[PDB]
Amino acid sequence: MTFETRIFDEPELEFGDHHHHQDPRLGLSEAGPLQTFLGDVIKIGVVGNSKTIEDTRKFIETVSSGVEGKGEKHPNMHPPFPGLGNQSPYRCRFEIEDGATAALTKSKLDKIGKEPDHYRAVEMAVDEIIGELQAMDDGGSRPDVAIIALPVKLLERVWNPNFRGMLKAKAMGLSFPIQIVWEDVIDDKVTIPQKVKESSSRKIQDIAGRTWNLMTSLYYKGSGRIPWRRMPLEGEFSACYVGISFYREADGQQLFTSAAQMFDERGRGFVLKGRRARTESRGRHPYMAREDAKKIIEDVLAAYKLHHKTLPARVFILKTSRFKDEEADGIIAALDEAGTELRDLVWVQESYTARILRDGNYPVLRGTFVDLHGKGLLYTSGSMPYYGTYPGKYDPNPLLLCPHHTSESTVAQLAEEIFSLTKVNWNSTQMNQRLPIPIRAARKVGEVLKYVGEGEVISADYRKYI
Amino acid sequence: ANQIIGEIGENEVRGRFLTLGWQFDGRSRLEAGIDGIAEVMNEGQPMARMIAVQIKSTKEGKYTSESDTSFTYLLRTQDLAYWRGSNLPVIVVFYRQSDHSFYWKEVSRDAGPGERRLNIDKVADLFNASTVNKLAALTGEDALINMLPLTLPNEMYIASTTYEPRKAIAVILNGDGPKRFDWVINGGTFWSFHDPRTSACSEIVDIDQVEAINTKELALHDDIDEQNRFSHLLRQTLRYQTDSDLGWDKDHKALYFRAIEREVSRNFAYTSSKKKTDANVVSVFKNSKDETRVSFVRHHAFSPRFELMADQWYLIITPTYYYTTNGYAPHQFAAPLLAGKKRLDKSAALRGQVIMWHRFLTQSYLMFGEPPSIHLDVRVPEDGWVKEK
DNA sequence: ATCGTCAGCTGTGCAGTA
RNA sequence: AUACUGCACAGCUGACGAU
Numbered sequence: 001m002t003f004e005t006r007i008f009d010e011p012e013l014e015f016g017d018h019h020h021h022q023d024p025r026l027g028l029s030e031a032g033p034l035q036t037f038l039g040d041v042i043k044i045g046v047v048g049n050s051k052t053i054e055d056t057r058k059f060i061e062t063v064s065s066g067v068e069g070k071g072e073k074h075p076n077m078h079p080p081f082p083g084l085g086n087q088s089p090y091r092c093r094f095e096i097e098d099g100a101t102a103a104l105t106k107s108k109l110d111k112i113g114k115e116p117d118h119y120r121a122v123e124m125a126v127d128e129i130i131g132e133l134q135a136m137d138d139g140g141s142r143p144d145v146a147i148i149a150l151p152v153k154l155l156e157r158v159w160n161p162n163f164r165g166m167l168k169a170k171a172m173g174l175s176f177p178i179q180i181v182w183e184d185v186i187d188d189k190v191t192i193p194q195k196v197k198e199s200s201s202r203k204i205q206d207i208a209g210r211t212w213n214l215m216t217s218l219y220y221k222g223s224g225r226i227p228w229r230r231m232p233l234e235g236e237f238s239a240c241y242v243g244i245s246f247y248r249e250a251d252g253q254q255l256f257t258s259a260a261q262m263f264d265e266r267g268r269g270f271v272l273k274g275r276r277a278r279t280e281s282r283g284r285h286p287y288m289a290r291e292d293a294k295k296i297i298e299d300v301l302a303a304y305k306l307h308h309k310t311l312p313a314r315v316f317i318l319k320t321s322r323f324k325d326e327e328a329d330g331i332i333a334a335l336d337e338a339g340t341e342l343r344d345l346v347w348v349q350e351s352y353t354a355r356i357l358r359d360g361n362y363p364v365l366r367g368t369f370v371d372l373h374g375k376g377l378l379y380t381s382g383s384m385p386y387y388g389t390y391p392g393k394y395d396p397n398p399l400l401l402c403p404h405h406t407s408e409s410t411v412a413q414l415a416e417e418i419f420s421l422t423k424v425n426w427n428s429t430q431m432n433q434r435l436p437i438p439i440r441a442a443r444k445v446g447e448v449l450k451y452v453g454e455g456e457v458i459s460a461d462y463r464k465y466i
Numbered sequence: 467a468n469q470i471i472g473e474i475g476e477n478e479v480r481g482r483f484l485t486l487g488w489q490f491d492g493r494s495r496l497e498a499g500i501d502g503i504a505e506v507m508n509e510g511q512p513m514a515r516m517i518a519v520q521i522k523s524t525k526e527g528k529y530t531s532e533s534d535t536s537f538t539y540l541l542r543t544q545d546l547a548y549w550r551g552s553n554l555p556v557i558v559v560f561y562r563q564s565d566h567s568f569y570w571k572e573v574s575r576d577a578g579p580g581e582r583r584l585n586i587d588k589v590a591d592l593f594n595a596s597t598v599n600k601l602a603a604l605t606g607e608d609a610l611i612n613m614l615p616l617t618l619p620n621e622m623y624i625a626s627t628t629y630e631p632r633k634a635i636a637v638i639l640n641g642d643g644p645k646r647f648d649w650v651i652n653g654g655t656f657w658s659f660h661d662p663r664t665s666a667c668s669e670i671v672d673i674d675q676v677e678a679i680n681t682k683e684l685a686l687h688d689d690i691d692e693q694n695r696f697s698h699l700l701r702q703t704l705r706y707q708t709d710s711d712l713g714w715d716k717d718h719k720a721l722y723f724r725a726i727e728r729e730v731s732r733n734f735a736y737t738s739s740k741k742k743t744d745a746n747v748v749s750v751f752k753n754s755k756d757e758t759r760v761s762f763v764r765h766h767a768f769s770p771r772f773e774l775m776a777d778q779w780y781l782i783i784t785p786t787y788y789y790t791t792n793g794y795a796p797h798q799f800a801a802p803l804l805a806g807k808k809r810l811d812k813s814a815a816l817r818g819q820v821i822m823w824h825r826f827l828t829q830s831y832l833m834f835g836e837p838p839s840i841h842l843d844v845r846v847p848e849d850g851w852v853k854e855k
Numbered sequence: 856a857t858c859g860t861c862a863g864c865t866g867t868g869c870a871g872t873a
Numbered sequence: 874a875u876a877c878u879g880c881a882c883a884g885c886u887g888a889c890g891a892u
């Protein structure tokens with residue numbers, strides 16, 4: 001048979017103090033973040049109605065004192081939160097100062113719940129919140145990170161036009177990032193329905209996972225220092241990673257292109273910058289032009305030569321769409337203008353109706369690579385011999401890696417190295433991440449950048465996007 | 467609050483130590499890293515010269531990866547380098563407020579750096595009267611894929627004829643001959659697997675322009691529109707040589723079975739080698755209360771997508787379910803039921819389907835081979851889990 | 856400005872957290 | 874929007890072939 005199957009191991013993640021482990025949860029609980037925070041204070045401001053603020057304070061007070069696991073069934077799936085003590089997996093503590101806390105009056109919420117027009121009601125709610133946060137920022141009570149805790153009666157009008165995209169677009173002029181929390185997470189008594197008819201209500205996972213995900217996001221947003229990173233091997237050349245995705249305008253059918261840049265820091269650090277430019281559209285097509293790709297590569301090389309005082313040696317570009325001649329010509333022309341000799345161009349396809357089948361009521365392990373005559377089938381979702389079982393039903397779909405014909409490295413090394421780039425994102429802490437962070441970061445940047453008006457400020461800081 | 471728990475932990479650990487002697491000083495508030503200096507008592511006289519001890523106290527709560535038998539602790543390399551360069555052995559203890567779990571662990575000073583990842587263990591590692599001198603003497607499975615290698619026949623047929631396909635369909639339904647479904651016309655060219663002139667379908671083709679061409683010439687090329695026409699021809703052929711126990715529905719491209727035996731389920735036993743195909747291929751379900759009203763009679767179908775690899779063509783299988791309420795009418799609502807059944811079935815139902823279909827069902831012009839088999843380097847340890855249905 | 860053919864990429868929502 | 878997987882439904886895109 002002309003099929004060569006590989007089972008890559010789980011990639012390691014380098015935490016602080018030269019410790020590496022495959023689990024972000026236990027790894028953070030063991031060694032803490034990679035880039036430590038010089039200090040001990042993360043100040044939090046809360047915006048919402050009165051009851052949301054009291055439940056937010058109660059939530060912080062409860063989760064600061066340890067959280068039990070879900071059960072003894074598959075313990076690695078549900079590890080207990082250790083709280084913000086001396087066993088804290090952040091080496092810092094969060095406090096909610098009383099000098100800045102925005103309580104929303106019931107008259108304004110009543111006026112919000114009375115407007116029949118859908119657009120301007122969400123717009124005025126977003127603008128009022130933004131004005132409260134701006135007056136928060138202008139004073140001497142600046143917080144490190146803000147929390148928008150929403151009530152139930154606001155949520156019937158806001159949810160039942162997006163709210164997160166509008167708020168994160170209109171909050172990009174501030175000096176701190178914000179985080180949105182629904183009513184259901186803070187209070188376990190009440191629970192809301194959704195858009196379709198609902199006799200029942202929504203359901204979320206238990207408070208162990210909520211605390212881990214929410215507070216890892218809060219720590220990265222507040223401190224500004226990255227929790228973990230991909231562990232670099234010894235011997236390889238210097239490299240710079242780019243990812244490309246697409247999105248829509250929410251009113252028309254026109255498609256845009258997003259981007260994200262990564263390179264290793266000169267030392268122990270990582271860079272997840274965005275791009276302070278709003279690439280425009282050239283038609284409703286999932287393919288970009290060649291000049292904008294050239295400008296992307298020049299910006300990437302300028303950032304690398306600014307940080308490292310030298311050019312890189314390798315460039316990795318990940319794309320959701322298939323590479324074409326024009327984009328490859330532009331990237332190659334930019335690179336040989338700069339003078340780099342190692343290139344790798346890979347298209348990721350998420351719609352391939354081929355799978356690896358076996359008997360035993362369970363699918364194959366995560367990290368299964370099959371060479372389909374120059375292509376690559378990768379099982380980034382699958383069975384896990386660390387979580388106990390495979391979390392989920394039916395089968396996990398695989399993704400296909402299609403390299404360009406100008407890429408130097410073979411399909412197996414590229415597949416392993418893309419498999420090492422998946423579990424990097426700091427929004428989550430689980431392992432079942434089927435999308436590499438050059439793709440997911442570009443998707444997040446594009447999702448936030450949907451509602452940003454023309455002639456506005458676009459920040460390259462990643463904390464304004466997740 | 468956490469500042470007093472360390473002091474009381476140090477005090478009660480010292481009380482345990484002073485319980486059987488073990489002269490402990492503690493430190494002042496000027497200390498950093500190593501805690502106070504302790505010794506070992508010998509029946510009422512300090513025979514031991516000196517040793518170093520460090521306190522580590524935590525609140526109520528289990529440790530990392532603690533499941534009834536052990537736990538794990540990690541050591542900072544600054545502290546490890548601090549203790550490695552020293553002149554005295556050190557010991558490390560743990561918390562005391564759940565059930566007073568005073569444990570001892572010692573790091574050695576042998577050749578070679580690196581001593582972290584203290585993995586503590588069972589009841590042979592505790593401070594008690596059981597043993598006290600022990601730390602005082604320091605003076606695969608091959609799987610398959612869902613592909614089907616397809617062996618082509620010898621010759622196809624080509625022609626030239628310029629009628630619209632809508633008129634040709636209306637010609638072939640209103641006629642008297644067999645309902646042949648092997649004809650694809652695109653670009654003005656008549657294509658078929660059977661010979662047009664040896665058929666009743668010759669009415670929509672010219673008699674003098676029928677030619678026989680080799681299969682392998684058009685199987686491989688650089689053009690992809692001809693590949694799309696080839697795949698449509700293969701779909702028409704697969705519809706043709708199976709339309710006796712099924713039909714066609716454009717939703718999910720399903721060849722769902724036709725129920726003509728007056729609401730009888732079909733087990734469809736095959737038993738190819740030892741014992742298989744004992745699962746119900748077609749199932750019958752009645753309503754909640756009344757048997758006069760039928761809820762849904764269900765059966766599963768599939769849809770084939772054809773492709774090429776190194777000039778060898780392949781077919782895919784995506785089996786879907788299909789719920790018919792009362793018969794040949796399309797279902798009023800099937801998304802929640804299809805979602806629920808897909809939520810219910812594990813991976814073995816797909817395995818049972820690929821071992822029961824397209825080798826032993828509707829395979830008894832195109833010859834269908836065995837699905838390809840691959841070697842997996844690591845077998846999934848399914849025997850260790852709970853097997854939670 | 857319409858209709859079959861194939862091949863793939865974003866929005867929008869529901870279960871289920873095994 | 875604490876997060877991810879699976880499923881379902883939609884809209885869109887470039888070469889066909891014809892009015």
Ligand SMILES: [Mg+2]
Nearest residue numbers: 217427465466
């Ligand atoms: Mg987020």
